[PDB]
Amino acid sequence: TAAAIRAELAKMEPFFPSGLKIVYPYDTTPFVKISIHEVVKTLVEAIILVFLVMYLFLQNFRATLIPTIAVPVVLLGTFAVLAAFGFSINTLTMFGMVLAIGLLVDDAIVVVENVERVMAEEGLPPKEATRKSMGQIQGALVGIAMVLSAVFVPMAFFGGSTGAIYRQFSITIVSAMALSVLVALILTPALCATMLKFGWFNRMFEKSTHHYTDSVGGILRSTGRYLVLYLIIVVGMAYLFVRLPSSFLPDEDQGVFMTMVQLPAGATQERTQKVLNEVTHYYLTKEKNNVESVFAVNGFGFAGRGQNTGIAFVSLKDWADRPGEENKVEAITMRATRAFSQIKDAMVFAFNLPAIVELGTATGFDFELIDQAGLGHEKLTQARNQLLAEAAKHPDMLTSVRPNGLEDTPQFKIDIDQEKAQALGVSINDINTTLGAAWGGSYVNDFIDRGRVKKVYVMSEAKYRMLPDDIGDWYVRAADGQMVPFSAFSSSRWEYGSPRLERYNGLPSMEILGQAAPGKSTGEAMELMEQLASKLPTGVGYDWTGMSYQERLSGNQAPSLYAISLIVVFLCLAALYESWSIPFSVMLVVPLGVIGALLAATFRGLTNDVYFQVGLLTTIGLSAKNAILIVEFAKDLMDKEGKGLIEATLDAVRMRLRPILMTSLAFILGVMPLVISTGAGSGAQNAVGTGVMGGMVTATVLAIFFVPVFFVVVRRRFSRK
Amino acid sequence: TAAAIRAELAKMEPFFPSGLKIVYPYDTTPFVKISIHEVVKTLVEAIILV
Amino acid sequence: MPNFFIDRPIFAWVIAIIIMLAGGLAILKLPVAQYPTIAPPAVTISASYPGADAKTVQDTVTQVIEQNMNGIDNLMYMSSNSDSTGTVQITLTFESGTDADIAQVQVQNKLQLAMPLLPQEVQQQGVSVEKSSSSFLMVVGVINTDGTMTQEDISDYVAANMKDAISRTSGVGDVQLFGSQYAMRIWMNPNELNKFQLTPV
Amino acid sequence: EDISDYVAANMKDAISRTSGVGDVQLFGSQYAMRIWMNPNELNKFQLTPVDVITAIKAQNAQVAAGQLGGTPPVKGQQLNASIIAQTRLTSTEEFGKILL
Amino acid sequence: ADAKTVQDTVTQVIEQNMNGIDNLMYMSSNSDSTGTVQITLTFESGTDADIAQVQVQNKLQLAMPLLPQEVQQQGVSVEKSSSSFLMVVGVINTDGTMTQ
Amino acid sequence: MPNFFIDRPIFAWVIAIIIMLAGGLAILKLPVAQYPTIAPPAVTISASYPG
């Protein structure tokens, strides 16, 4: 749509009068535009870091050109598949590729990272190595993938305002993972059989490998302290996990916000402007290093036109020009409100709309307060007045209850006496019109301006309709030609009426917004309200609409789902090793990753936003993957060899180091930017980035010396008696 | 839809005038709920004889 | 298995490529919309009664229209709400997944039943039904450098000459105009009407 | 003809906007403001229901009337309010006291 | 009529409101001297013709309040533009009894 | 097919667990009624203009 408008406009430009230009206030398009492109930059660039890590470990050109050209193949094919699946390109469907680039560098590493050894076994054979390495690996790849699936898919299975938000990650990754296998059984094998094949340098790892291979096994021996350690690191999470608050999506600086300025009902257009200026000025002067434009509009009600409301589309600079959170919409719009609420006799205020939250997390509750019987406006006002009152006495918990500007304002009745009227020969009709034409406009019919049919209205010159005493100017030809005046068939009397009538679902209503601010739970507030909404006089009902419709509706338990995932992560695993027992060797890693994540997320100022589950499953899962290959090599370097007890674990954890250390470092250094990002779309970057990096390092080493124990702890403790 | 009708009908009782009952005459929903108990039951029962 | 391509490559060195093109194509055309859609459709009839007034707008139009709303598939709620600025807006939030086209249609069948009851002044006024998000897509500033025209001259302009199309265009669900198109305005005067013995009638 | 009005003006509107709920025909009829003509007694006054209708139509009607502090105001201007004009008969006494 | 007397009373105003309508390419329009007004609107490639006839159509529905009573009587109609198709039977009388 | 699974029954048994576990959910959130959509659809026009 925006391409069009802007291009429609175009056709215009060439023809308007002289000095008439289209400026561009608050537009939301370019953020989105820049945003999902500031993400592309990531992928594009992180395929670079990966190319370098795949060097400090492999030290060749064309032997590097192979694993680094895997993710770009896979990813491209994901976009195709996305399209097939009638999906789109957007943040979620992108980070999903980001969080998935791990799952690609690795599956490529793993392969060539293997035909890399076995080249240390056969002297000099390429096709033999690559092929030999396959087979004793191929059925392994097909299984991880057939298992990670489940670490993703059982989300994006609970639906809701949300649900579809996760289904985006889910799909993008469940596939693009699959393509990783097709590349794996097609591109990576060959090609790595086509172009495959410092004493204080190279020697770094290798010297430090045995020292690893040593430290292992010997562990948990003449001090069982280690198998305890887990129940510690575990009891580690669970704590911190309930301490870390949850959130849907992190609000972001789009580069634009707007400012309400609703005065109280009955204000004057001329005053409303006053307020509006000043708001227009404050921004102009003070935060001028940010505020780049201010399209001050007055009379424009967001919930209906009005002489007493208005709006201010404020528009910032390029972000780039605004370093540090002080120059972020949140802060800019923090002080911006402190300054108002001051020198301003009206309820002015600014704020940044919550991205992707067409109602999802607008924090609080709509509580429509309906008139369930033939009650009336007045009564109902009151019944709200009470419900409103109590609301105040319970501030114990965090609240801020209130209505929407339907405050009764003075009306001026004028009661026409049909008798005196027909008494004096006047008709009611002639009067009616006179009333309702001088003082309420009227459109006769359609003149034509410059070949563009336009409207025609008869009404009183302002100056003859501004105070009740003017209703004394109009007289009205009777049937005797005698001009008679209103004060002769009428009489007026001030009173109170309402400038706004709600209704909700056919019954008259009155919206009461409000929240349970930092402290209590959004389900207590409601409970409470429902509680004291059952006092109020007979006839008064209530109901939820909006964020609260969706609260009592759309929360399809995650653990309830994530369990069905355990069952499937296991049945798969077992499925794979044929053992109702071996698989616990790997599942057990789960914690070693989320341990890092549930940290950093606490260290940095972060939440349980999405982008945390995605980087929580990408590790939770990936982690369980490097663990397969280090529990797979046993039961094998054991069941199909001259080795056993620890002899199994031996070259297993020994051969699972170069890979791990490579991938883990391939991914991490790759997610670098994300973590501390510039500022445009940062919100989402930073949150992805801190959750992963600090959840990777925490489960790379802190697992490398840890799966081994598991495996043994596992089956050795199954052959006990 | 039955489960909504009655569910709404539940919302508009609390405010009924002094004494007003909502008889539920003709409704073809108990039948469904049964002619599914039968079959479903004969299924287990099927399973059994086999 | 891998074997195949291991010996005979240049056959996997093409899959990759084709596969890659598939993503090239599929990118030139994949919708880069903001983020997925999650917002339940909403239609909002919205009439208007010149200088009318709240209780008047609403006992006389809004109740009318609402009563007439039924037979509307997937409909979470509706919520009239209408100002005494002689003006109304009634907005129905249909489920999620609901085909906007059809509700928008749906709704329109009903309301058309009431057209015939509204007061003439609301008919002629124009009455309208819509299918859009409430938040604003974008704003289009129109300024005048020479100061060769005024606020009132620009609201016109714009109207004559630019809404029209805006208003008309796939995508442009609803254009508000931040002013007003011109109109022969007959600012009367009573003393006179009085002198010569005339009335606005 | 007391309760029917109830369910019609009190519950047929939501039922029929409820989920699944197709169409919704009502075994009853909402409350009209029934006004029964008397032939010989209308005659008694030289009046046809035509006249009646005339009255009903100007006695019980709503009338838009504009606002003090109108749409565009004079430079000054402070007071801004609706001017409520004629209006609809809510009771049944009035319907009875209409002036023929 | 005549073109002004029509483009001013109807081509427009109607065409003032074609706004809301989905996948619209362009809308041309004719205002001839016989009181005819055709205002066809070709729409993007494979849009659902049935659903664009709607809106278009349904959106006239709001301008009529505005059309003059001469026109709204004849009725503006809306259809899918084809104006040469399948067969065209003809019915003549070859014994000068029946006129056009 | 056999000779696998017969040799390697866990996997097998596993597949049998999944099919069951996967499905059988689809009994706790799958629609219920007497007959599905059986009647053809109909539409009615409705005119109604005084005696």
UniProtKB/Swiss-Prot annotation, chain A:
<feature type="transmembrane region" description="Helical; Name=3">
    <location>
        <begin position="65"/>
        <end position="84"/>
    </location>
</feature>
<feature type="transmembrane region" description="Helical; Name=8">
    <location>
        <begin position="557"/>
        <end position="573"/>
    </location>
</feature>
<feature type="transmembrane region" description="Helical; Name=2">
    <location>
        <begin position="36"/>
        <end position="55"/>
    </location>
</feature>
<dbReference type="GO" id="GO:0015895">
    <property type="term" value="P:alkane transport"/>
</dbReference>
<feature type="topological domain" description="Periplasmic">
    <location>
        <begin position="604"/>
        <end position="609"/>
    </location>
</feature>
<keyword id="KW-1003">Cell membrane</keyword>
<feature type="transmembrane region" description="Helical; Name=9">
    <location>
        <begin position="584"/>
        <end position="603"/>
    </location>
</feature>
<dbReference type="GO" id="GO:0042910">
    <property type="term" value="F:xenobiotic transmembrane transporter activity"/>
</dbReference>
<feature type="topological domain" description="Periplasmic">
    <location>
        <begin position="678"/>
        <end position="683"/>
    </location>
</feature>
<comment type="similarity">
    <text>Belongs to the resistance-nodulation-cell division (RND) (TC 2.A.6) family.</text>
</comment>
<dbReference type="GO" id="GO:0015562">
    <property type="term" value="F:efflux transmembrane transporter activity"/>
</dbReference>
<dbReference type="GO" id="GO:0015567">
    <property type="term" value="F:alkane transmembrane transporter activity"/>
</dbReference>
Swiss-Prot record, chain B:
<comment type="function">
    <text>(Microbial infection) Involved in contact-dependent growth inhibition (CDI), acts downstream of BamA, the receptor for CDI. Its role in CDI is independent of the AcrA-AcrB-TolC efflux pump complex.</text>
</comment>
<feature type="transmembrane region" description="Helical; Name=2">
    <location>
        <begin position="36"/>
        <end position="50"/>
    </location>
</feature>
<comment type="similarity">
    <text>Belongs to the resistance-nodulation-cell division (RND) (TC 2.A.6) family.</text>
</comment>
<comment type="function">
    <text>AcrA-AcrB-AcrZ-TolC is a drug efflux protein complex with broad substrate specificity that uses the proton motive force to export substrates.</text>
</comment>
<protein>
    <recommendedName>
        <fullName>Multidrug efflux pump subunit AcrB</fullName>
    </recommendedName>
</protein>
<comment type="subunit">
    <text>Homotrimer, with large domains that extend into the periplasm, interacts with AcrA and TolC. AcrA may be required to stably link this protein and TolC. Interacts with AcrZ. Part of the AcrA-AcrB-AcrZ-TolC efflux pump.</text>
</comment>
UniProtKB/Swiss-Prot annotation, chain C:
<comment type="subunit">
    <text>Homotrimer, with large domains that extend into the periplasm, interacts with AcrA and TolC. AcrA may be required to stably link this protein and TolC. Interacts with AcrZ. Part of the AcrA-AcrB-AcrZ-TolC efflux pump.</text>
</comment>
<feature type="topological domain" description="Cytoplasmic">
    <location>
        <begin position="1"/>
        <end position="9"/>
    </location>
</feature>
<protein>
    <recommendedName>
        <fullName>Multidrug efflux pump subunit AcrB</fullName>
    </recommendedName>
</protein>
<comment type="function">
    <text>(Microbial infection) Involved in contact-dependent growth inhibition (CDI), acts downstream of BamA, the receptor for CDI. Its role in CDI is independent of the AcrA-AcrB-TolC efflux pump complex.</text>
</comment>
<comment type="function">
    <text>AcrA-AcrB-AcrZ-TolC is a drug efflux protein complex with broad substrate specificity that uses the proton motive force to export substrates.</text>
</comment>
<comment type="similarity">
    <text>Belongs to the resistance-nodulation-cell division (RND) (TC 2.A.6) family.</text>
</comment>
<feature type="transmembrane region" description="Helical; Name=1">
    <location>
        <begin position="10"/>
        <end position="28"/>
    </location>
</feature>
Swiss-Prot record, chain E:
<comment type="similarity">
    <text>Belongs to the resistance-nodulation-cell division (RND) (TC 2.A.6) family.</text>
</comment>
<comment type="subunit">
    <text>Homotrimer, with large domains that extend into the periplasm, interacts with AcrA and TolC. AcrA may be required to stably link this protein and TolC. Interacts with AcrZ. Part of the AcrA-AcrB-AcrZ-TolC efflux pump.</text>
</comment>
<comment type="function">
    <text>AcrA-AcrB-AcrZ-TolC is a drug efflux protein complex with broad substrate specificity that uses the proton motive force to export substrates.</text>
</comment>
<comment type="function">
    <text>(Microbial infection) Involved in contact-dependent growth inhibition (CDI), acts downstream of BamA, the receptor for CDI. Its role in CDI is independent of the AcrA-AcrB-TolC efflux pump complex.</text>
</comment>
<protein>
    <recommendedName>
        <fullName>Multidrug efflux pump subunit AcrB</fullName>
    </recommendedName>
</protein>
